[PDB]
Amino acid sequence: MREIVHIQGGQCGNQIGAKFWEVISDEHGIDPTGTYHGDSDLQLERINVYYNEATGGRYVPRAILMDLEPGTMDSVRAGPFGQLFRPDNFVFGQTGAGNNWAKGHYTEGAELIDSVLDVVRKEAEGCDCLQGFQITHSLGGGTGSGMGTLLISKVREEYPDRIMETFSVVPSPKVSDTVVEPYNATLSVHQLVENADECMVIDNEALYDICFRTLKLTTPTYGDLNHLVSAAMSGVTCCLRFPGQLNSDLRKLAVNLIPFPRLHFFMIGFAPLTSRGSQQYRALTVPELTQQMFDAKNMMCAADPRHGRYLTASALFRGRMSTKEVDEQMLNVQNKNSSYFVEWIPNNIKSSICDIPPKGLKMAVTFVGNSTAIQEMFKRVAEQFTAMFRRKAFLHWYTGEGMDEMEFTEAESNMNDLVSEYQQYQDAT
Amino acid sequence: MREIVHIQGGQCGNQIGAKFWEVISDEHGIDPTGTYHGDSDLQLERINVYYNEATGGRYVPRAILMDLEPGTMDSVRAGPFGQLFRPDNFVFGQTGAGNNWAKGHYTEGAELIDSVLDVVRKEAEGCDCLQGFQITHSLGGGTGSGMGTLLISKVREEYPDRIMETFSVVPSPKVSDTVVEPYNATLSVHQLVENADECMVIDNEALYDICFRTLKLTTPTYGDLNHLVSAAMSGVTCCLRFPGQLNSDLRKLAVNLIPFPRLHFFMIGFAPLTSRGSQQYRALTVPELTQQMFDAKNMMCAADPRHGRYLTASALFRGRMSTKEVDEQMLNVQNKNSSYFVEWIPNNIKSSICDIPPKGLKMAVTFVGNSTAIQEMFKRVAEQFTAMFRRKAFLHWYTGEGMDEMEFTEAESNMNDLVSEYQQYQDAT
Amino acid sequence: MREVISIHVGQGGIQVGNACWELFCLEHGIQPDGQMPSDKTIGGGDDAFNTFFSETGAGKHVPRAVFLDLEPTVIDEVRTGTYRQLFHPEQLISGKEDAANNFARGHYTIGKEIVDLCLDRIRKLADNCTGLQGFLVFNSVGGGTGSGLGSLLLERLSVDYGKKSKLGFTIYPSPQVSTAVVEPYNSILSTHSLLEHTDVAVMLDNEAIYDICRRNLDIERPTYTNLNRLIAQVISSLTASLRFDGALNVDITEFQTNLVPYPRIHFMLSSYAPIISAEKAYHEQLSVAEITNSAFEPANMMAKCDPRHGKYMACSMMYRGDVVPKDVNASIATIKTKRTIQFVDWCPTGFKVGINYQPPTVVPGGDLAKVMRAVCMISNSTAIAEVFSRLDHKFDLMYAKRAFVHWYVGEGMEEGEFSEAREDLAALEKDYEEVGIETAE
Amino acid sequence: MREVISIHVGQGGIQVGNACWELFCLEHGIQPDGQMPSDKTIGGGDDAFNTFFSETGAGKHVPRAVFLDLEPTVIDEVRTGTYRQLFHPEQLISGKEDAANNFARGHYTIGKEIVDLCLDRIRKLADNCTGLQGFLVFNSVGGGTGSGLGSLLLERLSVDYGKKSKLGFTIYPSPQVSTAVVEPYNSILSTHSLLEHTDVAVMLDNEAIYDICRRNLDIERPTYTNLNRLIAQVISSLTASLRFDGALNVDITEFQTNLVPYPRIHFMLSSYAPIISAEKAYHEQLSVAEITNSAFEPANMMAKCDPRHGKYMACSMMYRGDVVPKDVNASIATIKTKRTIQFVDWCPTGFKVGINYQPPTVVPGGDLAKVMRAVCMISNSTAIAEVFSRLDHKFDLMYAKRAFVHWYVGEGMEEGEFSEAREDLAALEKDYEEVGIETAE
Ligand SMILES: [Mg+2]
Ligand SMILES: [Mg+2]
């Protein structure tokens, strides 16, 4: 039915989806137990395309658990809504990748892929007209990417018609949570540029910036952050989940978002984002949220539209309004800062609306535009990879996995090729 | 809509506007919470041109907070009606100007102007047909003037069409609340003669005189005083806020008040002013309040119409009466003391009426006439500046800011030029 | 946000400090251990204690001040005293062998010994602080480190931060009463090395404390307890703006180049009142005008230098409690009214009001009576140069006789420091000499 | 599932072990006999004690660690001590006649005597275990078996399993303080036979323990009780991830080829904090930034090798308790900020966060005060080669004089082991020599 599935690895991402399904449960108001306690059939109408009824009305996720060590499995296993799960999917590891990506990709990569792809495949038979599935990990290591690389390869072959919308955490330029990041990252991204269908960037520092400045929060954790992102990743299917006077699916999205298949790394904007007092400063209009939409500070990725140029831009609106406003602000904005709008893409802004906003708010905005400002991102990470690969720093942890360096060259001149590729598209008219 | 904004700095002025918006709230009878609890739509009809509805009907000010140290921000932040505010505008400083005006103008002047002019600019987009905005500080230091000088320059350039009606506190001739006053003052007034559109004089000693003699009060504070002045500054937009058989806006006012742009320092009269027993002495007539209108004791400024000559004179009437009276007293008075009426300005008195007086009273009077008696004001302050500038007294606090003295000459022969300028206009026929 | 921190040196000096933090802790009423008697409600609008009392994760709120002196006996009494829960060990730095009132010793000799520990502590606090405006430094030209080691202290601390304010409380050699005779050496050697390392500071003399506590407090037999209490009050009010709501919460940096208009002669007097008894608290009314007119009594002048012999320059009559802008204001007219008083006319008025709404709090066991209104006349005139002149003439002869010089030459100072420092008071004598000259025509 | 096991050798070494298992048993609070005070509820999500404390069919939960040393007196004290209900007989293997600090004796001579018993015990535990990640091995270059017999121990145990991690805690000859003079022989003879049998290990020196406990713990007169307590804390936190929820429950194997990027120079420093007193627990706040900035104090460096003389490579600031990713994160920016610090630039950043949510637990009778947050700076730099160089120069001359050599030649080692092992430190001197070279262009 255009239903989809979720698969998460990732040192964080395993938590991320926990929050995610948590949020969707709220938007479906079904008890933690797994039965519905809401007030409209509309939550039940399209419930299946994420959930699954069970005998007795156990309502369940179409999620897939990735992990190389059960702790997360216990963690979310210790999770509220944990009784809303299926014990089947608790597919984890006994070792951990140690985030040498070769470890999580050959060593443990080849070790535990099979049981996953089997049960996942059983989910594939459980899906009537599968629009797709949602993968989640991080692009700097192996706790997610280790195996998730193998996932994208295997299912991608196994389902060359299905959509692969991939969110994985990008290392911020400043803070290096690990120094093996350039290598895991580069080795992964070689794969992901080939095999993944959609990708959107996952920085932490942006999420900090949001929580601290625009959220005006002092205490950052993951969980709030995954609230902030699963807000958007939860919004994305809204029309696909719920009616909309102007609907567009991921196929309409990506096909209406990408000129050439190498450009499915997208940046993200969601809003509104206030602290409590703000409403008693300000109110909500479509033009208002628009005035956030093109905010670099909501630009939750390491790329700057202020520095790069919008190759593409789009808006995901959930609520009840007048599109006569919506479009009007659209075109207005597409003029107002025309210069950061790439040229030969006429009407490079594109529209949407969901008859219902997310719960709690009256109107919704989402922006997954695609400039080319990410070039500094790949340039950076490739740069650090370059330096220590001059040094071969921690190659020994690496070659101990029994990869070659020439692969590193492959993702290397590879990833540079993708960058310059974005250069010419940005530098053209 | 001819809506306007407020911006306040100033050791007092930050309090002043607090009282001001407080008063306007009363005249709009909206709860402190920010919703209307009044009895006529008329309060809601033109509410926007000062206020702003919010999502849910939070009704908010178009005010702008200036400060170089948050204490005031906490103060009014501790203010009744404080829940009627927007937390956004609480733009203050971490240092304080120390009232060396160069400190508040270069040092901290350049330090915090940006965040202000940005958010203010966001208010500029929030304004449909902005008649203007109201600034408030004092003309002797830097707690307001420090930055407010930069405000008038920046927005004045940024909005060369908007009205800049400026009220700032003038040091009384007798009591010197600080001795650096001539220098801050002179340096400011150089700017204000160039850049500000309207100005009205703000003495303290007049306000004392009003409270003690004509108010018959023994206990003076600021807050009552700002009641007395925000009474008038609140009256000014009445027609602009409410119907009037004889209406006149600030454009009609100033254009109908000023012969040449250097003359937008105006004196003020508001009334009635009694203590409680007085009503059981006297009653209200247009001729009565007229008989206060030309009272030097209501002449709330350091200039004497009894010594100078009315270059201009005007009346702001709110209530319900017969203009057949009003004019009649007008012309009557324009004869009765013709000598203090400048000559070649025929009908140098001018009229107005608002269908509603302010709350609590049945009839309103306001007088912002403009003689040229202020010459003693500038002559004094320039004189003290002259003396200690002979001494360079506290130049070291000053040049420590890294200004030049030649600027002091600039505002100096400047301000003298403006004085003599008023001399020739006064001495002419 | 608005921090200051106190530094304490010299025997009398840290005596003062002890009195002070006793005071403030009393005044916010946080119990000596470090807790408040009750929980603190969350609010905004202004700071609180946070200036000085140090927030913990619990009822532990230590001052932001530091002890430094090379005569470590007495400080131990704090190390023993009731507030041994109050203060904090690393708050405590002392020297064992003090200066023996060799300026040159704890300034030079032992000057080298504890400086780095001091600066590290300073970095810990200022790093702990954010909007620390300025520096409260206390010492004494008697408890010899109070001159010498403090001299290096500002000498370097200024060069560390600079942009902070220098809040200078040190004691000055009483005019005829004294403590030693090398005081000339301590003082002037301090002074030439004091000035250019000082921002501004006041000169507290004791004999006034005696005479006035005995007449105005009705004191029979006082000591450093009473003195330290009195300076405790004066500093208690000199900074209320950063602690309490007042109409014109003026600030130190605000005071700086406005009270002391020129850069040079940047010291002053300070006659606080109303200091009276419980039997004069009653039998009296204590008007604003009484504190005000009384504020300028030369006989009330809290440092033994006749104002009437000088010409005033500035007067920051910051007020505690129920003050009226008008009433004080007209009193200031009354101060313009005073024929006997004469002002640096090129600064005709330089006044600067302070009306803080909290009236004073009293320390139990004290001699001052309770009132509703406080005054601090931080004022600067021409008068104070004279007693300096006594200092340089006394020191002039004694130094001419080479008295004691062996003591200092023995510790690493040169003679041109002496004669040149006398040139220093020469120049400052030219300064009080010149600024008091009325500008011609 | 996630097991590790501890091995204990050398006098100081098993001293450390005793402190450690005292600690952990305290921290899970299982009573010394082997029971918990109360029943254990059935739950899931992560492991518990099960790592190390050994489940019985009843309240008997013994460590998963092993004692081995040829100097069997002191271990008997454990055989006697309060935990004689805790431990288990077959947990205990000792030698009677120790090495006399002949490396070659308990390594060669008595090396032959107890090995098989050791390996059998190891097979009993690892067979008892499932997901044992790595090996906790403790010994000492002093209590001579700690060098020799341990040298064979890893020499063969590595060849047994291999795939387990080598968790190396041994003590290093203090730079100027010592225990003997054959220490050169013990150490270097260990080292050439240490490296290729070691995965990674840290070097704890004592003099830091002294200086820092005496200043930071405010200790007057310490000993192995304090030392063993301190290392007890550091190991207490170096493995919390496998014991307690933390945001980034990093793992040993994770640490391995990431902290020590190359294979060779795979040792490191470790300055734990916050070690303060009860009187500094109060009078302080102990910020994340305080532990963090404080974490890199070279004077805080818990092994007597100046970091500022070296260039850092990695820093795994695993944290106990209420840690914020952001706050620490910006502190790490602050660490990038430190001009004095210099990093193996070809490894620009190699950082690896650890935020475990349990703040530290304190051992009663201890000197450390209680806090909310712990840091372990397992960091690797260029600096540490130098003290090695002292070791090979000292040993260089002494060996040149053939001092003591009769002792070792008497027990079955050859001279080329000596000169060649000096070639070993030659090579490692080339390693710290080379990896510190900045890659050209
Ligand atoms: Mg001393
Ligand atoms: Mg032994």
Residue numbers in the entry:
A (entry chain B), B (entry chain B): 1 to 429
C (entry chain C), D (entry chain C): 1 to 441
What does the paper say about this structure?
Conserved in both motile and primary cilia, the doublet is the elementary cytoskeleton of the cilium, comprising α- and β-tubulin heterodimers, forming a complete 13-protofilaments (PFs) A-tubule and an incomplete 10-PFs B-tubule. The outstanding stability of the doublet is likely linked to microtubule inner proteins (MIPs), which bind firmly to the inner wall of the doublet microtubule. To structurally analyse the doublet, cilia were isolated from Tetrahymena thermophila and split into individual doublets using ATP treatment.
At the outer junction, where the tubulin from the B-tubule attaches to the tubulin from the A-tubule, the M-loop regions of our fitted tubulin models in the PF-B1 stick out from the density map. The M-loop of α-tubulin seems to adopt a different conformation while there is no observed density for the M-loop of β-tubulin. To account for the specific conformation of PF-B1, we performed further real space refinement of our tubulin model in the PF-B1 density. While interactions between tubulins in PFs-A10 and A11 are canonical lateral interactions mediated by the H1′-S2 and H2-S3 loops of tubulin in PF-A10 and the M-loop of the tubulin in PF-A11, the interactions between PF pairs-A10/B1 and A11/B1 are specific to the doublet. Our calculations show that the interfaces between pairs of α- and β- tubulins from PFs-A10 and B1 are relatively large (buried surface area of 688.6 Å2 and 462.1 Å2 for α- and β-tubulins, respectively). The interface between α- and β-tubulins from PFs-A11 and B1 are weaker with buried surface area of 351.7 and 137.5 Å2 for α- and β-tubulins, respectively. We also detected salt bridges between α-tubulins from PFs-B1 and A11 after the refinement of the tubulin model in the PF-B1 density. This conformational change in the M-loop of α-tubulin of PF-B1 is likely to be induced by the interactions with the PF-A11.
